[PDB]
């Protein structure tokens, strides 16, 4: 019906230029509109023939420093920040073209991506938006790390970090964001990625974080933030972990109706939670809404 929560795509094709956080290679990003029930599909246009990797949990390869999409030997690195923007603005179908193996880091947040998508405009499609509603509690744990899916009428993200560093200890360790009352754009999207300088030195030698800089990452010592202009939020470190979680959870293919709880969790435990959820079919269901007013999740005007 006309009053249903409709599927969404881009209104126009938008282009952006940047560098890969871990590869350091120059990359041309092209966001394009896609037909109904396509989902988010990544395309390597630098290869002949063009290789397409759908942004799904089954196509997740490595989860060391970032979330990587793999198809054979073709890779698409650091997809979590762009997928966070797609999820936050409710983009159902989109073609993501890349001229290199990694998504541009931009400023280390989802901020420029949310602006690039909203500048291009949103288009409502003649199809019902599919939602994955959490019925039962699903949790994955490994040592002192845990990732939980709790039933909730709407969408809520909770995260708890525990870094033994004065700069991290001196800041907020836990944050709960309810997207029915809080804006993804205003409070989450701007949270930049963070890294330890002494840890980044070992990574740069081991062919990782090659495109890392103070302009696209929060560089930290023991007591303070090395960035001249400081932080964007007092709780920016835990807000970025929430941003990363929203992006990782969007690999389900559909928007979530439930609560996510992250306890020192990362990209590996986030993918392991999705795989355990998909495997436990009694714990979830596919739901559509014929009336947008009755739904527990609302979206920004197209």
Ligand X SMILES: NC[C@H](NC(=O)c1ccc(C#CC#Cc2ccccc2)cc1)C(=O)NO
Annotated binding-site residue? 165: no
CB of 124 to Zn ion, least distance (A): 29
By the rule CB under 6 A, 66 interacts with ligand X: yes
Query: Nearest Cα to 132, choosing from 149, 146, 147, 117?
Result: 149
The one of Zn ion, ligand X, none whose footprint includes residue 125, by CB under 5 to 8 A per kind, is: none
Q: Among the options 267, 273, 274, 297, which is catalytic? A: 267
By the rule CB under 5 A, 107 interacts with Zn ion: no
Distances (CA, A) of 247 to 157, 205, 267: 12, 28, 10
Q: CA–CA separation, 95 vs 85, rounded Å?
A: 14
Please give the structure tokens belonging to residue 255. 């928007």
Q: Is 229 exposed, middle or buried (0-12, 13-18, 19+ CB in 10 A)?
A: exposed
DSSP state of 60: B
**What are the two backbone dihedrals, phi and then psi, of residue 31, each rounded to the nearest 5 degrees?**
-100, 125
Task: Tell me which of 110, 209, 220, 256 binds ligand X, using CB under 6 A.
Answer: 209
26 and 210 in contact (C-beta within 8 Å)? no
Task: Tell me which of 4, 128, 185, 200 binds ligand X, using CB under 6 A.
Answer: 200
The one of ligand X, Zn ion, none whose footprint includes residue 151, by CB under 5 to 8 A per kind, is: none
Site for Zn ion in 222-251 (CB under 5 A): 244
CB of 137 to ligand X, least distance (A): 26
CA quadruple 286, 290, 293, 299: dihedral, nearest 10: 60
By the rule CB under 6 A, 248 interacts with ligand X: no
Piece of 90-98, 161-169, 195-203, 270-278 that binds ligand X (CB under 6 A): 195-203
By the rule CB under 6 A, 244 interacts with ligand X: yes
The one of Zn ion, ligand X, none whose footprint includes residue 212, by CB under 5 to 8 A per kind, is: ligand X
CB of 244 to ligand X, least distance (A): 5
Piece of 35-43, 47-55, 112-120, 210-218 that binds ligand X (CB under 6 A): 210-218
Please give the structure tokens belonging to residue 145. 């790390």
What is the DSSP secondary-structure string of 168-230? Answer: HHTS--EEEEETTTS-HHHHTTT---EEEHHHHHHHHHTT-STT--TTTSEEE-SSSB--TT-
Q: CA–CA separation, 232 vs 291, rounded Å?
A: 37
Site for Zn ion in 181-210 (CB under 5 A): 193
By the rule CB under 6 A, 195 interacts with ligand X: yes
Element spanning 105, H or E: none
Q: CA–CA separation, 114 vs 98, rounded Å?
A: 17
**What are the two backbone dihedrals, phi and then psi, of residue 90, each rounded to the nearest 5 degrees?**
70, 35
CB of 121 to Zn ion, least distance (A): 26
- 165 catalytic, yes or no? no
CB of 207 to ligand X, least distance (A): 13
Task: Tell me which of 13, 36, 214, 300 binds ligand X, using CB under 6 A.
Answer: 214
Site for ligand X in 75-104 (CB under 6 A): 80
Which residues bind to Zn ion, rule: CB under 5 A? 193, 244
By annotation, the residues acting in catalysis are: 267
Q: Which residues are documented as binding site for Zn(2+)?
A: 81, 240, 244
Which residues bind to ligand X, rule: CB under 6 A? 65-66, 80, 193-195, 200, 203, 209, 212-214, 217, 219, 240, 244
């Amino acid at each position: 019906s006309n009053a249903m929560i409709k599927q969404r795509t881009l209104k126009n094709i938008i282009r952006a230029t940047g560098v890969g956080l871990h590869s350091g290679e120059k990359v041309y990003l092209t966001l394009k509109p896609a037909p109904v029930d396509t989902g988010i599909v990544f395309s390597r246009t630098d290869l002949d023939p063009v290789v397409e990797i759908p942004a799904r949990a089954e196509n997740v390869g490595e989860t060391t420093m970032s979330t990587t999409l793999v198809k054979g030997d073709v890779k698409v690195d650091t997809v979590e920040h762009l997928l966070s923007a797609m999820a936050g603005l409710g983009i159902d179908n989109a073609y993501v073209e890349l001229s290199a193996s990694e998504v541009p880091i931009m400023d280390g947040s989802a901020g420029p991506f949310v602006f690039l998508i909203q500048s291009a405009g949103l288009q409502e499609q003649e199809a019902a938006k599919k939602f994955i509603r959490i019925k039962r509690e699903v949790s994955v744990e490994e040592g002192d790390k845990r990732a939980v899916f709790v039933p909730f009428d709407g969408f809520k993200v909770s995260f708890e970090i525990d870094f033994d560093h004065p700069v991290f200890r001196g800041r907020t360790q836990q944050a709960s964001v309810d997207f029915s009352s809080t804006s993804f754009v205003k409070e989450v999207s701007r949270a930049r990625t963070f890294g330890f300088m002494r840890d980044i030195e070992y990574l740069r030698s081991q062919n990782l974080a090659l495109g890392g800089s103070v302009e696209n990452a929060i560089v930290v010592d023991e007591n303070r933030v090395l960035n001249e202009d400081g932080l964007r939020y007092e709780d920016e470190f835990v807000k970025h972990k929430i941003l990363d979680a929203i992006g990782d959870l969007y690999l389900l293919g559909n928007s979530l109706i439930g609560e996510f709880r992250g306890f020192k969790s990362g990209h590996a435990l986030n993918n392991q939670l999705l795989r355990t959820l998909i495997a436990d079919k009694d714990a979830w269901e596919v739901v559509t809404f014929e009336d947008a007013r009755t739904a527990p999740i609302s979206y920004m005007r197209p």
